[PDB]
């Protein structure tokens, strides 16, 4: 009976996937204007191809210099400060 919030919280995500989409994570900076948000919400709709209205979360993390990381479920494209760590080709060659 102690683990009853564990069973309930598991059941919502198990029932979510019957219509849900495993939401995204865009963690770059301060929130931007509306035209940049609606454009990413209308290209990610073209990626699901499952007839399900995607949900999304935005987080603020200033440690990334000027780029953004985007995850779609378990996909995780990357355009961030790791293009500065790819400058080891000037050293390791």
């Amino acid at each position: 009976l102690s683990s009853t919030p564990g069973v309930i919280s598991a059941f919502s995500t198990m029932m979510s996937v019957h219509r849900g989409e495993v939401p995204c994570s865009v963690t770059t900076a301060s929130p931007l204007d509306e035209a940049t948000l609606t454009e990413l919400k209308t290209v990610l709709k073209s990626f699901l191809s499952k007839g399900q209205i995607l949900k999304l979360e935005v987080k603020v993390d200033p440690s990334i210099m000027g780029g953004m990381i985007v995850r779609i479920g378990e996909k995780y494209v990357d355009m961030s400060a790791k293009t500065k760590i790819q400058k080891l080709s000037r050293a390791m060659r």
Partner: protein, 70 residues
């Protein structure tokens, strides 16, 4: 990422513009490689920059002995 790329190419050319050599090294890199090469040249050999070597050698004196036979 090309706009990030040319930003790197800019800072390589300002590193090309040098007039005093090592700006960030200071005496640390100057006292190191001067003492490192002299520790390696002591293991290498005492040879000058333009003195060509020339010498001669002495062969053994082919002596003889005596032996009375017939």
């Amino acid at each position: 990422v090309q706009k990030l790329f040319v930003d790197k190419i800019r800072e390589y050319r300002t590193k090309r513009q040098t007039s005093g050599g090592p700006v960030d090294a200071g005496p640390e890199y100057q006292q190191d490689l001067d003492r490192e090469l002299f520790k390696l040249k002591q293991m290498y050999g005492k040879a000058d920059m333009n003195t060509f070597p020339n010498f001669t050698f002495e062969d053994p004196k082919f002596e003889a002995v005596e032996k009375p036979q017939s």
